[PDB]
Amino acid sequence: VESIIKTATDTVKSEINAELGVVPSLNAVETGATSNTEPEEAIQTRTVINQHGVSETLVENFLGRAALVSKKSFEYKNHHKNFFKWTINTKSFVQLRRKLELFTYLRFDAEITILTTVAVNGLPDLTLQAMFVPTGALTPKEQDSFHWQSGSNASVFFKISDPPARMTIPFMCINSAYSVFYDGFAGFEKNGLYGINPADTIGNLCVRIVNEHQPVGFTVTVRVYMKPKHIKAWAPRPPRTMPYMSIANANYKGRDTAPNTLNAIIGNRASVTTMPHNIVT
Amino acid sequence: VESIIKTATDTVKSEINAELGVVPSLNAVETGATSNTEPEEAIQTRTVINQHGVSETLVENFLGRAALVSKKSFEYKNHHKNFFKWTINTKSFVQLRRKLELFTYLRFDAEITILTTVAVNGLPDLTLQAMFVPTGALTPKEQDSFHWQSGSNASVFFKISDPPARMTIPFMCINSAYSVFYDGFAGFEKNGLYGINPADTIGNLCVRIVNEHQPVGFTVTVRVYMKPKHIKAWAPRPPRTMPYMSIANANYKGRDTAPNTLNAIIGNRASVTTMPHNIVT
Amino acid sequence: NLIVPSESSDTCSLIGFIAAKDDFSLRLMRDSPDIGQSNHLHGAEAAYQ
Amino acid sequence: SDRVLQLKLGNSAIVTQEAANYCCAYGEWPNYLPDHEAVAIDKPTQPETSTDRFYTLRSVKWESNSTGWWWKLPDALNNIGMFGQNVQYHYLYRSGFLIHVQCNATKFHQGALLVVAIPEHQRGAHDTTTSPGFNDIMKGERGGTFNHPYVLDDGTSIACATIFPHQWINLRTNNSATIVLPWMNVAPMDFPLRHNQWTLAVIPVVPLGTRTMSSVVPITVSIAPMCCEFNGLRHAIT
Amino acid sequence: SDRVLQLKLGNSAIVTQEAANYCCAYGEWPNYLPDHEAVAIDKPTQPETSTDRFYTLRSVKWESNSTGWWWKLPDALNNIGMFGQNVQYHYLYRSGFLIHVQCNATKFHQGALLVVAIPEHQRGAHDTTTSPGFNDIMKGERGGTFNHPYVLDDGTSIACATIFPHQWINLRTNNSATIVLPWMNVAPMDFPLRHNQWTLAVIPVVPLGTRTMSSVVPITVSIAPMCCEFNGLRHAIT
Amino acid sequence: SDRVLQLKLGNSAIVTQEAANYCCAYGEWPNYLPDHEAVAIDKPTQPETSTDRFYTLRSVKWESNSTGWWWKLPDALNNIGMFGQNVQYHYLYRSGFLIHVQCNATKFHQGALLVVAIPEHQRGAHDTTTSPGFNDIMKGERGGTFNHPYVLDDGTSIACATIFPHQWINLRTNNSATIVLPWMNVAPMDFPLRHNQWTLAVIPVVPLGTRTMSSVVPITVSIAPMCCEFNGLRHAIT
Amino acid sequence: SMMEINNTDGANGMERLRVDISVQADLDQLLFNIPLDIQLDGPLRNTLVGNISRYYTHWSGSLEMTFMFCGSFMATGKLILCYTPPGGSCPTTRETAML
Amino acid sequence: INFYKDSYAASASKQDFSQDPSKFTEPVVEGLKAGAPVL
Amino acid sequence: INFYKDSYAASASKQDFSQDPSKFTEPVVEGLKAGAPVL
Numbered sequence A, B: 001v002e003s004i005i006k007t008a009t010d011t012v013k014s015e016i017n018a019e020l021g022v023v024p025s026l027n028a029v030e031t032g033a034t035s036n037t038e039p040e041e042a043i044q045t046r047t048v049i050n051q052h053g054v055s056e057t058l059v060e061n062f063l064g065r066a067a068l069v070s071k072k073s074f075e076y077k078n079h080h081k082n083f084f085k086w087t088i089n090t091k092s093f094v095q096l097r098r099k100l101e102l103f104t105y106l107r108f109d110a111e112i113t114i115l116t117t118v119a120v121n122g123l124p125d126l127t128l129q130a131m132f133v134p135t136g137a138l139t140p141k142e143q144d145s146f147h148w149q150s151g152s153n154a155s156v157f158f159k160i161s162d163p164p165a166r167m168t169i170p171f172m173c174i175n176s177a178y179s180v181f182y183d184g185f186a187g188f189e190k191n192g193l194y195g196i197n198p199a200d201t202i203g204n205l206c207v208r209i210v211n212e213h214q215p216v217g218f219t220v221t222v223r224v225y226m227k228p229k230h231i232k233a234w235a236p237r238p239p240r241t242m243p244y245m246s247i248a249n250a251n252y253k254g255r256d257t258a259p260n261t262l263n264a265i266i267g268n269r270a271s272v273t274t275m276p277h278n279i280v281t
Numbered sequence C: 001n002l003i004v005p006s007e008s009s010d011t012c013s014l015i016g017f018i019a020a021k022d023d024f025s026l027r028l029m030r031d032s033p034d035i036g037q038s039n040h041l042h043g044a045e046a047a048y049q
Numbered sequence D, E, F: 001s002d003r004v005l006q007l008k009l010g011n012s013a014i015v016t017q018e019a020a021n022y023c024c025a026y027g028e029w030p031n032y033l034p035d036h037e038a039v040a041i042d043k044p045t046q047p048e049t050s051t052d053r054f055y056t057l058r059s060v061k062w063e064s065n066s067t068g069w070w071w072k073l074p075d076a077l078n079n080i081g082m083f084g085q086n087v088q089y090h091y092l093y094r095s096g097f098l099i100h101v102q103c104n105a106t107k108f109h110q111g112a113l114l115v116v117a118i119p120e121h122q123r124g125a126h127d128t129t130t131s132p133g134f135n136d137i138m139k140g141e142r143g144g145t146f147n148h149p150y151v152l153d154d155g156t157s158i159a160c161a162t163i164f165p166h167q168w169i170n171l172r173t174n175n176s177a178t179i180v181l182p183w184m185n186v187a188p189m190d191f192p193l194r195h196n197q198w199t200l201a202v203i204p205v206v207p208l209g210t211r212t213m214s215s216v217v218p219i220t221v222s223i224a225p226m227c228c229e230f231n232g233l234r235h236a237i238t
Numbered sequence G: 001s002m003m004e005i006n007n008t009d010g011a012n013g014m015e016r017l018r019v020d021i022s023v024q025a026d027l028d029q030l031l032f033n034i035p036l037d038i039q040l041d042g043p044l045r046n047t048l049v050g051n052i053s054r055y056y057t058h059w060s061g062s063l064e065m066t067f068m069f070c071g072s073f074m075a076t077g078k079l080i081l082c083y084t085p086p087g088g089s090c091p092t093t094r095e096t097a098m099l
Numbered sequence H, I: 001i002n003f004y005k006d007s008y009a010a011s012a013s014k015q016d017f018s019q020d021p022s023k024f025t026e027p028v029v030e031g032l033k034a035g036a037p038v039l
Ligand SMILES: CCCCCCCCCC(=O)O
Pocket: A069, A088, A089, A090, A100, A106, A110, A112, A169, A178, A179, A180, A181, A200, A202, A226
């Protein structure tokens, strides 16, 4: 059943059919199988050598794009006091979230790109430090605490004048793949969080401005992008239709009016015999 | 008939001719063919080994130049509010337009270069984002809308202090070549636009300043250049003579006075026996 | 015509399905118009606390 | 030929004379954990016939205004028979499942049920930011009911639910649905009391209807664990 | 030898005793769509003789102050004979064209017509920014007239129009022009009612003149579609 | 095996799950005109898919007192689709026909229709010496009705009509009849507007009856010309 | 996946995923039509093919629509489903659609 | 060419053209023949 | 050398020296001989 597919399938010419006991256009949806009726069996076709490629839909390409996963603005001045901590998650920005949620399980390495911008409340070319604090490790409490010495944690130092910082985080789940969805509880007691697999816990990204404060204040914004690569995906799923409500669950409400309202996903038309964008000549 | 030509053709010496039934200098323009009279048949020639190259006129080189296709200035300040949207087209700047219009069909990949400049109303080294929004996709409504998260759209982030941003857009027409000219209507009804092939619809280029506004305002200008490459061209055409009037059509009016007036393309001379720059000794 | 006996319901339903065949192909990736956000999702900001 | 079927496991057997072939989730079949994928090092217990057999749950009634039903696995069976005992006495479990949904009526009735096995069906709550609680998820043998089947109670859609292993019970055509489920997880084994690999959903997309004598029309679910393995023996968390 | 010519297609034939060889646009010849360039998968209809034949349009009069005439293809034939019927009943069409322009006078008349086949002749409007409308472009069998032939009604020039497939009818030399046109488009087939692949232009660069008895001097156009193919059958958009 | 059938021609297809095999008139099958039987010397047009496809006519209602219906060929199709256009633009035509008559009811209904294809069915008028007129014979797509089915409206008898190619639609047994008709004439081709090779007759020998809920029971006719050929091209006699 | 053909006011939730057909009193009756809009909202938008295709801009290939009749076993009938290539107005009579 | 010592640092792998749609389109135990009645 | 994975990203291709002017200069069905009268 498995095979290498590089282009869309060709079409073979077909002739008239009038065979007893043969009804290719009839099917039984109840079996759970999709119709296997071929164009050649439904109508008379010509031969077509199809050269259309299928590489742009490879999962690696579909998910292989750097998408915004974190955006944080804070004030850089004499006092988030010149630094912040972000509990890593891929559920805050809807474009990336919806795409990842088209799958049940995903295994991939993640390229992380960090873009920094500044505005005066000229622009100083500041040095920032982004430290990866794994689960169970202590997070910094001040712009200058000892934690920043980063003896074991991985830290990256970059300047606002340099290109965005970049590094790859390996597939680090304690399982063979990340659980995009998790129908279970994170603990042995009954009060644990539902829908959050502990196994997919990355940790915290701690970012600070290394420079001591200047005589005036600035607004610094840090944007983090993630691009999955070396991807393997399993069990595709129904796409999200209702607007997202929380980063911690799949709770839903729906838009106030169609489209995508809980009562009607598709916008209404006058009747089942009404053609919306009918060509009038 | 087809052959590899690397240099201009050589000339062969020729002798006196006095042959009945042979008249190489006579032709019949009515057939639609261009005269096939050779220099050797018109006059007595010497032998010349011509080493003149013909590579500078290769279509790839003729069209292979980065030309301005878009120029947009906007105010960067506290409020085009710090961003703009440009419906892509190659008909706004006449130098590039006239050259592309020397052909009926063109197939090529396009190298895009983006140059940014700023002026105070010192200069801040801002970060900009240029997002390619394909047909049917939603365009940003604010400098900070969710659209900029660019989960699938291709976006490029660049600084004013870096060299101009650059990337290549592939030949993306739904046909085998772009229609430089289109003698038809874009829709099934009769009110559609004439002369605009839907197939050649690229989309929108959305550009914003990523930085939040500064205490003072600046004027930012973005220039986009396009250079076609891997070019194939078909059916050359009469060059444009009348000044262009619109980016949406080939409408014409002509200059107020020659040259290039609707009534006279070439400037007048006193008479058909008057030699304009006659050498007076 | 739809023809049924007295004890069968006289109004019946059809369910229509659609799918692409293997001669299908898609190009030029773009962001989908089917999802969007105008505010932070609940808990997003708390991830920084 | 593909309308009649007999399933036999352990001391249990089931026959149907109106089947529609049967589904093997993702084209797979259950199997024991191989040495090259194993993690837990203690010798597992493989009870075979005492656990790999059909367990029939209490039936539900298909009513004119029903929204649908669901049962999570292994939760629905965690307290039934020897499968339930092994689950309570062991920290780890692994198994596939053979599902058989039953529903018959008359040639004068109409109705269509989508019978789908959803992997990791993480439920969402309606119109609130508070996540579903333990009692909203763990219903046990009784199973639960859909609040908004149209979006699968998770903000997506039942329209696209066919992407998951499934069959339909269209009264006019068949009276049973059968789905074979292999172990589905990112780990070779799991703790059975806090995570459900699969969710069996039965939803009436086309409501039950007729003009003949009204009768209670039940829907019954029979599930047989397959290739059961248990590790991490201790006392029962009964 | 290259002054006499007979063209025969279907049940139609034309002879000329004063031709000037004949033009094969870009050195090509019409042909049916090969399997390696095809896109539409339905079996096409190839009517052959019922559509691949000469259709003669209404004549026009060459006057002392004429500016020129034009006919767009396939529009000019979209409502003529079986070619017209196939065009109306099918979403897609494909074909080449054999064009024969006719004009005779006496050995005492003078005049020269440029007969050129222009691919994608996108018209421009004069002295306005508003684009030409549907009725300015789709003239059908009657064809149109040039407003400013000097710039080909598109802001370019007739002087350089010779870069396109063409012939001339110089009264003193010949009385007909013949041009064979292959399918010319960026797609293998097209919707015939909203796009014209070619535009036949006939322009008097040298006006008609004489000192002998005045007579009406007509110009007649005969066009034969070649290798016609149609796909996407449905009802007529008559 | 001989109860299910799918017919596919051009862009059209039909399936039936209650057929009764199918009839090939006189054991023949349609075919194009061979060179050794041809008369007209002009190259014919063979449109294939644009004409050789199923055309469904307006349905008729089977009532308790119906006498029967008839449709003459090619008249019934002479103004439908591309078959109709080719017929109007050409003096000569030739083709076979694939006929499919449809009629379903319930397992509580009874009735039997004789579906017969009669070659040269020359109608007679009742109780008068005046021959039937043009409008009594040429009904077009609407077809006609039998006045005295008992004698086939021609003074003979329906009892012996089984000598012609036929099938029956006996509600209790099947819901469709299929008959393949080859070219039937004494000439290789014919003028389609003044002569009908075949007449399709559908007659209720056993009336429609039931004691269950009354519903409109239609009879529908679908006809697909086969191996169409046309000669003698000219203008349309539309 | 299921097309939301009954996307009309008055149809709520799953009622929008099924098209009800009734015993007719007249002949050759039109039952319903389906807008083939994928970019614009319509019955095909929230389907597997529709959702995934909308992450792209260009498409090519054949589509297949399958309909399952969910009436009772004793119900019979014959329907005609037609696909009309572009160019004109949507057909409203069987005689036209049938072409 | 990946110049880093850890293979997970390498660029993307866009060369896996293997497919098996049948695990989603035909997960039925008994293969369904072309024109033969599915039931 | 193109280091990108997509071939369309490569530098220009200025090596196609093939020509056939005759498709524009002599599109006549019958070849015109050197000095022989064209008509
Ligand atoms: C920014 C670091 C990302 C690390 C990988 C996170 C994978 C999350 C998968 C999911 O559950 O949707």
